[PDB]
Structures are given as C-alpha cells and as structure tokens.
C-alpha cells in the first residue's frame with residue numbers, strides 16, 4: 722500500500738503463529754515487541770529511546786509476516802508500550818518513505 | 821524523493837537561521853528537537869516513549885523547512901536523543917510510507 726500519516730501506521734503482523742498489530746516506525750533502528758515466547762537462544766540487551774533505557778531479550782532469525790509480507794530477522798522482546806517494526810525488518814519488505 | 825531505510829532517514833531542517841538535521845519518524849506523533857535559538861517563552865508539556873515520560877517545551881506556529889518543503893506547526897524542545905520529525909509535520913509535506 723501507500724499509507725498516509727494522519728493516524729499511527731499500524732499494520733497486522735504474524736509472529737510465533739500469533740496475529741498481533743505493530744507500528745511501522747522509520748525512527749526505530751530495530752524491531753521491539755511486547756513480552757512473548759519465541760524460539761531459540763536469546764541474548765540480553767538494552768535499548769534507549771525518549772525516556773531512557775529498557776532491558777530486552779534479543780532473538781535472532783525470527784520469521785514475521787508484516788501486512789502479508791515475509792521478513793526474517795532480529796526481534797527484541799521487552800516492556801515497550803507498543804509493538805514496533807523498525808528498519809531492520811522494513812528494509813526486508815522494501816518499505817520506503819515518499820514525498 | 822523515495823527514501824529506503826538501510827540507514828536512518830535523516831533530512832535537512834531549517835528553523836530561523838539554523839540549519840539542522842532530523843529523523844523522519846513515522847512512529848512519532850509529535851516533532852521533538854534538542855534546542856532552538858532564542859525561541860522565547862514555551863508552554864509545558866509531557867511526552868512519553870520507550871523508557872518513560874519527559875518534560876518538553878512546546879512552541880506553536882513554527883515555520884520549518886524539511887528536506888526543501890515548507891511546514892508550519894508545533895515543535896517540542898526537550899531531551900530527545902535525536903531530533904525527530906513526527907507525523908504532525910510529515911503530513912504537511914505529503915510524506916507516505918509505501919511497500
């Protein structure tokens with residue numbers, strides 16, 4: 722699609738066999754999702770935004786469907802107030818900003 | 821332009837006589853920058869992100885050039901780690917997210 726920005730750019734995602742929704746966020750370097758179970762080994766990380774830092778679990782090579790488009794990459798899990806799709810996955814679906 | 825997301829989508833911004841850069845951020849409702857030169861009195865506001873909530877300085881009716889395009893609207897000054905152009909101004913310059 723072509724998504725205008727009068728409201729938050731939220732899309733349906735599928736991760737871990739579950740349908741969720743997430744914000745398409747060109748300001749986020751990495752994808753961060755609310756607490757859930759994912760396969761494989763994780764590594765502890767910190768991410769910082771407005772507000773300060775949070776503790777997250779880093780899982781690698783996770784399959785996610787974004788608005789019907791498959792992407793595979795790193796997913797961070799932790800206490801974000803909203804699920805966020807960052808640039809590491811937006812690049813895999815060929816998302817662009819246009820003006 | 822049609823901007824890919826392999827690196828941060830930074831663009832030139834001009835406010836008054838000051839040339840700066842800022843992140844085009846579809847995940848930000850509001851535009852927030854770290855400093856503006858001699859901008860006068862502000863109105864207090866709070867905003868929240870990953871991390872928690874911060875006090876910012878709200879300024880209305882600011883004329884800002886964003887990647888060559890003129891916008892007029894609200895700019896927040898506060899402790900943001902990177903200057904961000906949020907949706908309140910992205911809509912004025914006709915930006916859309918595409919995939």
Ligand SMILES: CC(C)CN(C[C@@H](O)[C@H](Cc1ccccc1)NC(=O)O[C@H]1CO[C@H]2OCC[C@H]21)S(=O)(=O)c1ccc(N)cc1
Pocket residue numbers: 746747748749750751752753768769770771802803805807845846847848849850851852867868869870902904906
């Ligand atoms: C501040 C940015 C450079 C970075 N952030 C992405 C950003 O889009 C967040 C994404 C976001 C969105 C909602 C809640 C928390 C975080 N937006 C945000 O803080 O916006 C603030 C200004 O406008 C307001 O509207 C939303 C909150 C306020 S972030 O969420 O801190 C972040 C940082 C690192 C990663 N990997 C993922 C996310």
Ligand SMILES: CC(C)CN(C[C@@H](O)[C@H](Cc1ccccc1)NC(=O)O[C@H]1CO[C@H]2OCC[C@H]21)S(=O)(=O)c1ccc(N)cc1
Pocket residue numbers: 756764765766767776777778798799800
């Ligand atoms: C996304 C979180 C689950 C990540 N964890 C953060 C941790 O502080 C959580 C933060 C936390 C807090 C509440 C709910 C989930 C996670 N605490 C926690 O798991 O506490 C456990 C012991 O008490 C039990 O009750 C709460 C969960 C259990 S962590 O994996 O230990 C970890 C630690 C350090 C870093 N940098 C990154 C990750």
Ligand SMILES: [Cl-]
Pocket residue numbers: 830831832887888
């Ligand atoms: Cl530019």
Ligand SMILES: [Cl-]
Pocket residue numbers: 857858859860861
């Ligand atoms: Cl002043």
